[model samples]
Target: HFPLTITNCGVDVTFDGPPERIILLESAPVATMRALGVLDSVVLRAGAFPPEYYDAETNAALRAIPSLGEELDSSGHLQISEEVIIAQQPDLVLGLPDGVTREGLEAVGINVLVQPTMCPGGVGATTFDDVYEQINTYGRLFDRQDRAAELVASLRQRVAAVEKAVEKRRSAAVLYPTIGGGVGYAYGNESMAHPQLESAGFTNVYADVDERVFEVTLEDVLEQDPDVLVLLHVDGDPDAVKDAVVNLPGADALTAVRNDDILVQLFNFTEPPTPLSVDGLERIHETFGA
Candidate 1:
């Protein structure tokens, strides 16, 4: 009656009650933990928790945690060694890093849990309900089921508000453009962008594509002619992300650009189906909704 077990990424991970000392290889779960009233369970963290992603109180609490390494590669993954993580003696690891594996951690008497969507053959098309499920997952892990329910209700209400406020159905596309005028990419039906666009009352122009994300040509985008374009980036100047897309050759011919319906958002805001995705939806409504 004490040990609780759950299947994560096809691995059976058992928790001897609740994890008291946890390490984060990814930061997406921070919001979930905060909502579940279990941020204190995290003993250490890795990678960046960009202050912009959290409210003032959450940011302050996050800053108080000791970080093993904050440096990230150009692509935004944390650069940390497995040995360093093992040295921390954490009871549970919340994310799967590049060189770390569940088998490796379990050998050292540490439990590992990876977000379902991040696992292989997991989510083909993510929805807001997936985000709610993630919250409840943490609740079960930390004995905060009631808190999870409350948070999911609040998030659902916010989603409903945006849905109610939207008056027009427009076609939109979510793009990730490299800064300094590099090649651009688009999210398709298999990615969070699809549902996000639909939730905001806009049709995804790239809905025909089955891939999650793929390289996109400005010429192709011009042909589809979406009404709005939401640009995403990991971290950097928002202006640069906008310029990367709008500065492309023949960009002016694109409907979204000609109409000035472009929006710049952080990567996590529209990916991996987190609570921030809801925040992104509300922001999209505020920017374009009637």
Candidate 2:
């Protein structure tokens, strides 16, 4: 049996045998691992829905892989039967974004590894470098270091190309302003959005704030008056985010609204530091031509 040491929450545990063939219950790490060609197969037992749904890109990627199982809504919360779990019998489990508790999976004797970026205390990652490092860590865990390096190199080149094209552009702010005058969160210095905005050649207006994401008021947004606005929503509909902005009770006064300069993006594209964010950067550069 091959002996391996796995680190979680800064604690190391040794395991016997090859890194177990795995399943990803969450879409973020699934997208990342699949992009790097690491996940052996997956069984989408259950997942979040509606406000927490997967985007089109992730949906397409999962459908392309034959190993993925039937899609389940977040509310499905299906209990895995012993027969089904044994059939797939994944050696390891990756990406439990919906808070699958240890007690639940441990009852079945399955080892699980949730992406650090998804953990509550996990370091907030803001750049492609952070995403690359997470992938590299997975590579080391699964003995796929070489492939991880290649993936990182490719992503780096893509990001650098975009950066080079827009390096001299003006700074911009990333926000998700909820409809009906609710919370308007800003991506601050430690958030992945900040680094992503920077990589795309736009400065994050909220870079001064230490928090990864924080709530702001419409009054605050008007004061900053960002040149461009990136709006994010979870359900994969850009129109929803845009509609939220357009429907805002007093949106016309904001510079982005007045100039019609809002770009709507899916939440997964910007949140949860992953290779997908590189694609997001390209979209931003294309939209603003900066």
Candidate 3:
């Protein structure tokens, strides 16, 4: 017999079987759902940015299904309306990020589940294990345990392949260099960015720090002098984005700058724990010949 209980965000959501339909309110969950062949539709709400890196993967999956309609704007924020939610009529909403409130969705009778790692006091994660567990969680919730197991195994094998490919590479630094005059942040040991960088066969220069994300000065960057520099482009042309770094003041002295060892990747690809992290790893491997 199935237990019936009402709980908050921390509440366990596994059920005896899968629901009829699922709606993903955020990008990370959407990626997971798409991977499992269960994401019916998406209504981008106030949450972390959508995973653009997986756009090809999601679009291909939707095409194969043909019935699923995917709508997303790259701005990373969705101005949701009541009509959209009512139209989709989702039985379950998964992975609502920080900017979205559960009460807002609940008032409309939409059941929502937020991943605990995205929560404020959660243990925090920076590896494929965290992502695999999340995918498994959705599988159990949807009563697709077999599918989840298979997906977890497949993703783990792929990740292992990448890990083995880059096991002998030198360390690098992950930088989200803002294009329009803002502080630069580095991914440390506590952030998913570090592990993703490791998977790509490069060690994070700031891995010694416990903070998830931390700001750094050009002097600090020069001191670290990572072999590979990953540049995150927020809003602008990719060419211009690359130029911004090459032209940064005193950047000429840096090894990555001098050797042109910079790799420009979209912001969302590296920030959150999503399928895009694997894509980011692939890009890194290709760029660095790892």
Candidate 4:
């Protein structure tokens, strides 16, 4: 009996132990797998990877895995077919995106692992605790609990160091403005952006709103212009992204614009409560706010 069972996203499914072959349909879990020294388990990966956001080992993992497809729709979903995936005969598949479904994969005899945050209703407001929980769950899934615990310990220590330096409180906004140029978007209380900013002792100006992200006009931004701004994107020139904002009409009125206090980050480092988010908090502290 090489297969065992676990409950995920409210579904009971048995996945084979120490699954030798895995196809990654999402990118965040790579941080967990690489940290646990199991990056080789992934045979194929689908979706974009921001090389600058990762370290040597993680970058090697991405380079080693063959790409199924690199670009994805804005919704974080893939348009690939189940038949193509079944052809790979993977023991486990990580992430449930547009064309990748739990039922469809299970029907094809492939065990699917979907992160709790991606669950239909979500597990609740995601935080560092949820980040650790996913690492442990992946530990069990890969039968590498010891390694997972070690990595989790390292991550917790880093986070503690960051929190101790949070004596000076500031106000900020975590925005997702279009890179080339277009309308700007902001993340509210529900997203990991909230905690990322808070960990650096910066209050999210949009904390009262419950929405994950919404479009904003320059006039609206001037109404509550934060002291600092951190822009997030999947991939682009950081300076180019900064120009995307400061170059906007009448943008110089905002404090962040006038003071030029802006930092650009990759999406994973600030969202979904991943280990990368912890490192991101460190970067924010050193580069922008307290």
Candidate 5:
């Protein structure tokens, strides 16, 4: 398709034609591309492609791409040179990062798109619908509408099955405590974690708060007293994530911790709205018998 105009991050990027070469700045977008069967289109990628996130075929495809920077900051955002991106002369760049802006890339005649959930100022109350829209958007951009429809149908089926099987309800919270030691955070109504918890048949303890992620106090957690705790991490030792939560002062008194109803999951599986999120929901449902 020629002259396809798509809105990304409130900016209209007109693609002269479907992109053949892509430069990826982040990982969430990779999930969409892989579902579209367009992973081969990515000529360059930045940041770590954890083997835990991909199958053998996808890992092989990723290994074939030229890696720019495997460096990530403390928060797990990619660190890369804009010059390296421009050098590739890609037709499209899949993520927007600090030191790299859509305006700057547009000035150099490159199209840029940011995942809807990752947009600045946040999209309020994320749901599985956001993920479906992303898959269909990429489908239109890549001229693969039928494939997108097929994929979405299958994903929808998977979620519905989980919902049907869920017989009991529980109260839960999604936490991201620093692996070593620092301020711990929890996601609220505006983040994808809320819908994930809901679909997994649990009520979000922090659903009342209208924030994506914020410094959470054990005092507040104690007050909510959820039945389950789902801990999230970027990529690291799973045991460390659990340790970070358990080590918190007053953590022992928490209902979930006392009951040992805690689950550790990767960050992508719970945030930024992706198909992997559906996978996360299934895992949570299985873990808690929800």
Candidate 6:
């Protein structure tokens, strides 16, 4: 078998060949493996993959796989044990929840991979091209380059139409404020939101900030006051998300609030560089332009 090495997130991940038994720890890679027709390779999955983010076929394939466990802690950490995961004898693990890294797993002959955007130093100023390249990477990793090529082409074509047809492009911010209002954060150039916004031909107000997501104050938001806003939450009532922003002190001072140019959606719709993010781009195009 030939060596297929991926130096992602500063980690030198070398897989001798295709993985026969895999474990999925994050939802992002689930979308990748599913798209590449490689879910059968995953022996166990942990954490979340909302059915709402998937189609009938994709959803069915996800559901058929047995999970090691589900649910993450309050701090976005998965609650599965390394012992239990090792018990299954996986050749590869697709996510590193709880800080379990290649150093720990590779000793036992398990190779690990991480999404570039979620890596330690973080992804550089991103566009849809970065997203496309990640898909291409997964395709090659699994020996499914042809399927990866086709999926990337379809997503690229879909995005092109929205970008082309966009008549009015709004200045927007992509946000993930905690439900019931503890802290609110905005996405900057490093996150998938940047590309999702670009796909819809909208400019991100936080594009200048290179970090992914960070807390912002009412004063700071009022200063930027983008023309349009999109709020994201993992699941549950979206109006709660809208209210979190609309009820902020002096919220009316913002243009998006005054003009009612706001959208609230599930988190995965525009995250982790998936085709679902394309669906989110369509929502923005349909509502704000197109």
- For model 2, residues 1-290, the per-residue Cα lDDT tens digits are 23666676554545675464666555567545555565444544333323233456656645554443334432222334434544566666665533356545656777777655444553654567778888887677666678888888998999889978875556678877564443367878667788888877776788788677778877788788888898876543556567766667786877778888888877667876777788788888898887
Candidate 5, residue 188: the lDDT equals 91
Candidate with the greatest TM-score versus the true structure? 5
Please give, for residues 1-103, the per-residue lDDT of candidate 3 as tens digits.
2432334346544344455566555556666666677655443333333335456766655444322223323323344554455466766666553345666
lDDT of 6 by residue, 1-290 (tens): 25887887776888778888989888877666777888788877888777887768878888888898876643245887777878888998887888576677878988888777777666688778876888888887889999989999999999888877864356889887666653278899988899788678778899999888878877788888899888887655778878878887788888998999999987767876777788888888888874
Task: List the candidate 4 regions with Cα displacement exceeding 4 Å.
Answer: 1-6, 73-79, 215-220
Candidate 4 overall lDDT versus native? 0.78
Clashes of 4: 0
lDDT of 5 at 234: 77
Order of candidates by lDDT, top first? Answer: 5, 1, 6, 4, 2, 3
Q: Which stretches of candidate 2 lie over 4 Å from their true place?
A: 13-21, 48-91, 97-99, 103-108, 122-125, 177-184
lDDT of 4 by residue, 1-290 (tens): 33667788898878656877989887788777777888888889877777876788789768878988766544334667777788899888888767566887888788887766656653455467877887887788788889989888988999888888776356899887775664378887667888778878888898877766778877877888899999887765677777778898888988998998888888888876688888888999999746
Task: Tell me the tens digit of each residue's lDDT in model 1 across 100-120.
Answer: 778888999999988776776
Would you estimate the TM-scores of all the predictions?
0.90, 0.76, 0.74, 0.87, 0.93, 0.90
Worst 10 residues of 2 by lDDT: 73-82
- Candidate 3 global CA lDDT score: 0.64
Provide the lDDT at 177 for model 3: 64
Cα RMSD of all models vs. native, in order, equals 2.2, 5.0, 4.8, 2.6, 1.8, 2.3
What stretches of model 6 exceed 4 Å from their correct place? 73-77, 167-169
Would you list the rank order by TM-score, best first?
A: 5, 1, 6, 4, 2, 3
Clashes of each: 0, 3, 1, 0, 0, 0
- What TM-score, to 2 decimals, does candidate 2 have? 0.76
At residue 87, candidate 5 shows an lDDT of 84
Model 1, stretches more than 4 Å misplaced? none
